[PDB]
Structure 1
Amino acid sequence: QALLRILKETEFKKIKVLGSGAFGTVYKGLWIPEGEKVKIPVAIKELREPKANKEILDEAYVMASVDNPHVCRLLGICLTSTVQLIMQLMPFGCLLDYVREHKDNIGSQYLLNWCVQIAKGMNYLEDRRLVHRDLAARNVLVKTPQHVKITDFGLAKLLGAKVPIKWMALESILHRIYTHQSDVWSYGVTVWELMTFGSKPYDGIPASEISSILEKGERLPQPPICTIDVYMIMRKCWMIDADSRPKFRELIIEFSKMARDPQRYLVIQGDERMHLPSPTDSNFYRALMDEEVVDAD
């Protein structure tokens, strides 16, 4: 309707590759409004290789209609040549790179608040009857360090089908069943990446072996900073019975409760000194970057 701008190729230019994935290649780009002299930074995802434009368009309107602070909305599309998706540029990049970069400077407050925020966005997708199919720390963007957003839901659907075996629920691997509860298993793996500061899951276990190890009951290890209460939640996200798994709305509650007493739930050396921004600093960041957090008691 009014939510998806159909772009002409003259309107924008791709400038520099920012990354790539199973579904396409992301560029930092510029939008040049017609009749204007300005160049506005955007991100453009050019999709890999099917579907008629009407169908892609139908799917694109859904992507354009998500409205939640923890979910990136599709802003515009250009489907003359390839399919190019236009979205807001996030100069901070993805949460996986961010946590690695900052592994010596991230506190329990940030970590548990990101868990809440990602659960909030996934709960929203579930409300909207939308299954992501590809949740991972690489798919969560940093708008500010205090504010992250899920991206790339439903690309899996749009393009059909680099398959992310190590994030997938057992049922998706064996029977290709994808549901909101399989997304819960990926959220579990995503929390595991965060709490290990960006470790690669099952590192040195070939992808082919994953179903077998899971079937035996093997799982990702307890990250050293995690108290057992944290680790128990991840293990619950990885139960064989989909329906046994927590629901996103429950994960929001549980992580929000931990975020109130964060040093009770995560043990980080020097954590007492890593806290959320002062009001002074927060007001500034928002003004510049986030015009669009749970504290300890």
Structure 2
Amino acid sequence: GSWEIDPKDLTFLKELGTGQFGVVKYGKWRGQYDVAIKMIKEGSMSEDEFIEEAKVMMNLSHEKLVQLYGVCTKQRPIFIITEYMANGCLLNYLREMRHRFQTQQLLEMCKDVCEAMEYLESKQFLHRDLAARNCLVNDQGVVKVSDFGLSRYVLDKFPVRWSPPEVLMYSKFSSKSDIWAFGVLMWEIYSLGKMPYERFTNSETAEHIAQGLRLYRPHLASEKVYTIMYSCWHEKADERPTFKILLSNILDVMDEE
């Protein structure tokens, strides 16, 4: 199948991490091309649904989306073969104080993610778990959005701190719950990877959000940048912007700043 990679074409070279979803390895495809090999933990996913969705996933392609190259499903664990992102998870990258980021770099990180999300929104595709922990950074410092849609197939920890009131109260998912999570991700970037609502538990965060209270301005965000992330948190989902509008707003601030 066109979504199917021959696992014999892989050379495993380095372990990149282990986690709830499984083990990830760096390797080469046909001796030459860098890949990530994501090995799905046995029993962790609805595998027939995941495999059918991978066929749809094959047609999603954008420079700021982690590229899916194929799956290996004729054995277990199944493998997801993806773009290799040398600098790892965005959350860990932000927390690495040596980079001494300028705010121009932080705004570019936001734009990278917003372009990916604008593309997913043009395809009516929801990420459903957008957060810095689900973005990756390549060897050039480019941020890309990873594992978009994956939570649908996970059989098991919910992202309370990235969820709007209507998700927490009613499980109402929409383009506007991705918009809300994007604003939280902007806050994560400008806070150099702090936990949102760091002094609260999830249960306390949910109550805070419902009472109408919000995250507030990171020290490194200008007034114009804060306006953008705060616009993502309107109580009323329909008053939140689209990713097209957020991209335009981010580009405008890049020009001003």
Matches within 5 A, 1:208-223: 208-223=203-218
Q: Matched residue of 2:189: which SS?
A: helix
Structure 2 distance, partners of 1:113, 1:156, is 27
Matches within 5 A, 1:190-229: 190-229=185-224
**How much does 1:62 deviate?**
1.5
Q: Does residue 25 in structure 1 map to residue 22 in structure 2? A: yes
> RMSD of aligned C-alpha atoms?
2.2
**How much does 1:52 deviate?**
5.8
Match of 1:167 in 2: 162
Q: Matched residue of 1:59: which SS?
A: helix
Compare CA radii of gyration and give the structure with the larger one. 1
Provide Cα deviations, 1:22-53, integer angstroms capped at 9, x if missing partner. 5x1342232463xxxx3654212222417463
Q: Is the 8 A contact 2:66 2:146 kept in 1?
A: yes
Match of 1:275 in 2: none
Q: Is the 8 A contact 1:77 1:84 kept in 2?
A: yes
**Identity rate of aligned residues, in percent?**
33
Structure 1 distance, partners of 2:164, 2:109, is 22
**How much does 1:66 deviate?**
1.0
- Structure 2 counterpart of 1:117, from 112, 120, 124: 112
- Structure 2 counterpart of 1:235, from 215, 230, 249: 230
TM-score, with length taken from structure 1: 0.78
Q: Matched residue of 1:93: which SS?
A: coil
Match of 1:43 in 2: 36
Provide Cα deviations, 1:120-164, integer angstroms capped at 9, x if missing partner. 110111111111011111211112444221111010123355222
Structure 1 distance, partners of 2:16, 2:163, is 25
Q: Is the 8 A contact 1:28 1:89 kept in 2?
A: no
Match of 1:62 in 2: 56
Matches within 5 A, 1:168-187: 168-187=163-182
Provide Cα deviations, 1:27-86, integer angstroms capped at 9, x if missing partner. 2232463xxxx3654212222417463x43320012221111111121121122122211
Structure 2 vs 1, CA of residues 103 and 62 (structure 1 numbering), >3 Å: closer, same or farther?
farther
Q: Is the 8 A contact 1:141 1:151 kept in 2?
A: yes
Structure 2 distance, partners of 1:248, 1:156, is 21
Q: Is the 8 A contact 1:123 1:248 kept in 2?
A: yes
Q: Is the 8 A contact 2:228 2:250 kept in 1?
A: no
**How much does 1:261 deviate?**
2.5
Q: Matched residue of 1:57: which SS?
A: helix
Structure 2 distance, partners of 1:128, 1:161, is 27
- Of residues 166-175 and 12-21 in structure 1, the stretch that sits farther from structure 2 once superposed is 12-21
Q: Does residue 127 in structure 1 map to residue 126 in structure 2? A: no
**How much does 1:21 deviate?**
5.0
Q: Is the 8 A contact 1:99 1:194 kept in 2?
A: yes
TM-score, with length taken from structure 2: 0.89
Residue segments in structure 2 that go unaligned for 5+ positions in a row:
none
Structure 2 distance, partners of 1:118, 1:91, is 17
Match of 2:251 in 1: 256
Structure 2 distance, partners of 1:25, 1:243, is 37
Structure 1 distance, partners of 2:155, 2:56, is 17
Give the aligned length.
Answer: 254
Q: Matched residue of 2:68: which SS?
A: coil
